[PDB]
Nucleic acid binder design. Structure first.
Lengths: 97, 82, 106, 95, 97, 109, 80, 98
DNA sequence: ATCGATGTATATATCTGACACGTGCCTGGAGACTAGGGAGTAATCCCCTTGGCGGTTAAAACGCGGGGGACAGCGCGTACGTGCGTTTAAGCGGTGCTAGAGCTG
DNA sequence: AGCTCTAGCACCGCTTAAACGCACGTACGCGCTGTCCCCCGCGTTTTAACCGCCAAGGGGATTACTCCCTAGTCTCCAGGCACGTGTCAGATATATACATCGAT
């Protein structure tokens, strides 16, 4: 049986998910998550499909930017693996935490 | 009442979203951290969008109200009007 | 005969609609005659370079219809529009295929 | 109302004037509309603030030329100022 | 010769300072910082009020525009406190002339 | 004609509702300004300056000065993380910064 | 010119002390001067643009405060 | 013998002194000359209000200090104490200024 | 060096549903005119900036020991990528159905 | 307030890619160490930032005057926008040749 060296499939799927541009989180879990978040501020709210597409696009853009930031902060510490402390460092530098 | 779908953003979804971010190796306990970040970001933007929705005397959240909710927070969004 | 203001200014973008939007936007109580002409010219210019870059990106992808991915590549490849549109994200735009040198295999 | 103000056929005219054989998706056209509206509001608000700056009530070409100079960076600002002054002179020639 | 009159909120923030700390004074530079702060807050809140007027195709700004803009730009706790205090003030105004 | 009393007395506020209304007119944000909007606005501005004056008085109590100094304003903004979120992009003239030291930057015994 | 070096080594050291920085490398100072030059050229560009609007040839503090307000770093203490 | 402080405690006292202080740590004359120099690249023969110079100095000092907490957290994050220029580059890169 | 899987670039054929294109029509833009005030110009004018001057001391510059912190090296072991079998549910189209934007007055 | 209708929600059955748990190996994080440099500490040197002061002057500010340029009003019309049509750009099918990874 054949098994790849661990480290090349990661780069291959980096290429795959940077070349493509489709929706990347599943639609229905994001539906449900927005429904629980919105029900705190006001119960029995209705959502346009374009509204939750807008929330999803904002989520992907924000988290891809944050993943850029935590990648470059992780390799700042000579690490190829991202730590959560990289994420708090990035959010602290950006000024939102 | 919908409950406990932060597990809905599953582990390979966060994996793909980090690979688009250019990662090689994922910490096994970073999933909860990214989930909390997405909670605070979506809570802020949904609070702003709902407060826009309440001013229009409407009970449905509009992508238009969402767009201005986003661009008040410093991040403009294109593709849904302006 | 009635001659439109766009042909007077030599532009495709309107002077009438821009002047109407400036007046109904309540930016100022008075708007000069040349200000909507100047604004239509500037919007025409920005659209000209962004569509040039989008067409170049579509040609690089061997595509003849502009996809939002091509618009994202056009705005992100050019650093001159990057700091202009770093405030904004693009729906269905994706990200540049950027990998850091440390992440590369030895 | 049902009359939606947009720039779709106008941006299509610009694209035909640039690339006559190139099509454009409707999503890309919507992003184009949002972009031109955002730039419109940014320059208009900057010009209105700069009119309120030294207590002028109207907006002339000087407000919006200086707003282009302030808002966009170097080469974009210089070429946009050149194009805007060209269009202004073309208008004043044609009255 | 004639002098252009300088518009400031200095005496009014002095009055509220004497209301909350009658023995405490304030320096003129801190006075200017307070005046600039209240001017900046006024600019952003009235900009958001004029916005929310433009959002839903209405030509005027009521107290509801100010309340919504307060709930937008002010973060949570002092947003609720400002909403309650402004509601108290506007009910005092409507109960009076 | 009745006795001249200001709109602030009707609203029970210290900020002038009339000057807020006049700056809404001269500021030209919308051509139609409601009657209760400057009342609500003067109320909100008065509450905000009252909260920051509370925090500045507390900062003076922790520092023991009887005059409010811009250092006290800057500290009053920073220690309240809620007000810090209000003024995250704001710099105060001769304000200084919070005295803080990182955890690992402290020496270890 | 040489005047960028007029922001002396003790000045960057004092700003790092105010920032709570322990050990400053010797080649930090040139990069700090470059970052200061970038920030100053942006802010001065916007300030003198507002100045050349008013057909004045002196940059007032009001020009500086709205120039700083434009990029998103509001400064208090000089007027609004 | 005269008392010579260990390396790392006069740094503590200077950090504490400059954190409790609010005076401008960059001298007035070199900064105003530098502002006059930089403004020559955009419009020649410019005058400057003094209050404009102090406003510029306030903003520049505040931006550089905030960058120094950012680069200090950058250096702390790399299991280090000394700040490298890569820490400053990281701080300006995450902030979106580069 | 060397072979094979494996993703990638390059030619032709078939299908569709999104976009190019045509038609129609109305509502906003163009045209015309007029008032009248904002903007512009000219005349003062004084203050605020520039510049010079001494002096002088705080401060920058400088040298230099030294130590401690950066950094390279090595070991390690476990955290985690990778792959396979199983299983869960997202997605899909369809169907229903009314709350509520949307509009008019 | 009344009316419209539409799109939002709700549900169902289905398919199957995705998620899931799983076992397994090794690459990478990290502790620990060696070195050594180079940054910190401080007296000495010296220079220039700073202060106080005085002249200038001109430039922003303020006035008064003017006019012309823009809002406002009005009519007119065609340009710009739902609708329909339609047909092809993009997807997927195939064969065909090439660079890349991994075990050898």
């Amino acid at each position: 049986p054949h098994r790849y060296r661990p480290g090349t499939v990661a780069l291959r799927e980096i290429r795959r998910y940077q070349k493509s541009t489709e929706l990347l989180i599943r639609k229905l879990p994001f539906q449900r998550l927005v429904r629980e978040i919105a029900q705190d501020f006001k119960t029995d709210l209705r959502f346009q499909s374009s509204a939750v597409m807008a929330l999803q696009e904002a989520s992907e853009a924000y988290l891809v930017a944050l993943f850029e930031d935590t990648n470059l902060a992780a390799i700042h510490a000579k690490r190829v693996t991202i730590m959560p402390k990289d994420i708090q460092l990035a959010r602290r530098i950006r000024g939102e935490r | 009442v919908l409950r406990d779908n932060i597990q809905g953003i599953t582990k390979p979804a966060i994996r793909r979203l980090a690979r688009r971010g250019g990662v090689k190796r994922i910490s096994g306990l970073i999933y909860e951290e990214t989930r909390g970040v997405l909670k605070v970001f979506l809570e802020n933007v949904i609070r702003d969008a709902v407060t826009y929705t309440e001013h229009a005397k409407r009970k449905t959240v509009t992508a238009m109200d969402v767009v201005y909710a986003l661009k008040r927070q410093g991040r403009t969004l294109y593709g849904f009007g302006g | 005969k009635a001659k439109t203001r766009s042909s007077r200014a030599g532009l495709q973008f309107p002077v009438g609609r821009v002047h109407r939007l400036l007046r109904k936007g309540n930016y100022a109580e008075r708007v000069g005659a040349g200000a909507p002409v100047y604004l239509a010219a500037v919007l025409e210019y920005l659209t000209a370079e962004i569509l040039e870059l989008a067409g170049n990106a579509a040609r690089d992808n061997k595509k003849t219809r502009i996809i939002p991915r091509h618009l994202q590549l056009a705005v992100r490849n050019d650093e001159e529009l990057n700091k202009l549109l770093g405030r904004v994200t693009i729906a269905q735009g994706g990200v540049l295929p950027n990998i850091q040198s440390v992440l590369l295999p030895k | 109302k049902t009359r939606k103000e947009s720039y779709a056929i106008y941006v299509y005219k610009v694209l035909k004037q640039v690339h006559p054989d190139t099509g454009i998706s409707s999503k890309a056209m919507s992003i184009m509309n949002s972009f031109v509206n955002d730039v419109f509001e940014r320059i208009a608000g900057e010009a209105s603030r700069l009119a309120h700056y030294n207590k002028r009530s109207t907006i002339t070409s000087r407000e919006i030329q200086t707003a282009v100079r302030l808002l966009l960076p170097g080469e974009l600002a210089k070429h946009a100022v050149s194009e805007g002054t060209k269009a202004v002179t073309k208008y004043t020639s044609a009255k």
